[PDB]
């Protein structure tokens, strides 16, 4: 009867899952958000959002605690979906996937410039020199050149670039297409 | 507590089912089956293989990325979110067709005289959350603003009135 753990861990691979948390004889609802790390080929530790039953109304969940990064607008997501009125299981999953969608977007952005480390691009070796927590400002070396880019968090578009300190436009555009713009 | 954790996981999956068969993980939804095979040496994934019994073309972009990156996380979420959006498309298309002179022209297209409105889900890689794109063969800008003002259903219906 231990196949359950095997079944669950398989579900957890999806990245989003609900689970009960018992504390002080109250059953909290936990939202588990797990990201896969393509560099380590492992899953990172889960982020958590914890919901507590309301003591004021029936059928209402409330935000109790969480450890999501500060760039996740967790309270804007909760208000927009629930209005502090409808916290149905369906809305909670809508809220969970909305936070997870934003986590993946940032995660994938940082992972992109770290996966390029060591790889060769345009017969030139890539080396990452700096990247902020949100992957919106990046500096990397390609051969003997130094590229610095500023990214718009909304559309993942490279909006500003410098090539060896000089303004550049040939590398602008979607962030994940920069590897195809070096031929210029 | 065992049974309550399954309750929450059943809620998580909703109408999707997950099953561990051999070293594979099967994602089922009414005869649809997505098979995920992973090889876990030490505590890390070294290889992955995906097999589908339907929507092979619709899922090729994101599934191709996941296999090229061994990212089972993006793979399984993409299938889950794909099954969800496709059902939402069917419901929305049906509501518009039944509530207006729009008629069902194909799986993803509705027509009103020479006006064509098409519903599309495409992968904005590497995101496993597909995006909805509603296209028309006439004035896209008027449709988009009407959708922006009144939402999908009313936007499309009101847009047909402008023709």
């Amino acid at each position: 009867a231990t196949d359950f753990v095997q079944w669950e861990n398989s579900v957890r691979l999806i990245g989003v899952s609900l689970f009960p948390v018992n504390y002080d004889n109250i059953e909290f609802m936990g939202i588990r958000l797990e990201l896969f790390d393509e560099l380590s080929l492992k899953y990172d530790p889960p982020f958590y959002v914890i919901l507590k039953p309301s003591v004021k109304r029936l059928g209402i969940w409330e935000l109790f605690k969480h450890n999501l990064p500060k760039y996740i607008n967790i309270h804007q997501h909760w208000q927009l979906i629930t209005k502090d009125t409808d916290t149905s299981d369906s809305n909670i999953m809508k809220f969970a996937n909305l936070c997870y969608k934003d986590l993946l977007k940032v995660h994938s952005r940082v992972q992109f410039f770290r996966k390029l480390e060591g790889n060769y691009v345009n017969d030139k070796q890539y080396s990452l020199l700096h990247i902020d927590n949100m992957g919106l400002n990046v500096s990397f070396r390609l051969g003997a050149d130094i590229i610095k880019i500023k990214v718009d968090d909304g559309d993942d578009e490279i909006i500003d670039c410098t090539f060896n300190g000089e303004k550049n436009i040939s590398l602008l555009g979607s962030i994940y297409g920069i590897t195809n713009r070096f031929q210029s | 507590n065992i049974e309550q954790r399954k309750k929450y996981l059943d809620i998580t999956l909703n109408d999707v089912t997950v099953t561990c068969e051999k070293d594979m993980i099967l994602l089922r939804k009414g005869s649809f089956t997505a098979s995920f095979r992973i090889a876990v040496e030490n505590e890390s994934i070294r290889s992955m293989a995906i097999d589908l019994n339907a929507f092979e073309v619709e899922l090729q972009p994101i599934i191709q990325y996941a296999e090229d990156t061994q990212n089972v996380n993006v793979a399984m979420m993409a299938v889950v979110q794909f099954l969800r959006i496709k059902e939402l498309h069917e419901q929305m298309i049906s509501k518009i067709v039944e509530a207006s002179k729009f008629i069902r022209a194909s799986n993803n297209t509705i027509t009103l005289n020479d006006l064509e409105v098409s519903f599309h889900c495409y992968w904005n890689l590497p995101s496993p959350y597909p995006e909805t794109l509603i296209l028309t063969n006439k004035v896209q800008k008027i449709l988009d603003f009407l959708i922006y003002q009144y939402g999908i259903q009313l936007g499309v219906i009101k847009y047909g009135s402008t023709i």
Partner: peptide, 24 residues
């Protein structure tokens, strides 16, 4: 436009027309 805001979430809607740019 509450309906559109909910549809954007449910459908992950992306409009073809970008109203942040000019329509020339």
């Amino acid at each position: 436009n509450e309906i559109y805001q909910q549809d954007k979430i449910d459908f992950n809607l992306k409009l073809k027309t970008d109203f942040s740019k000019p329509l020339i």
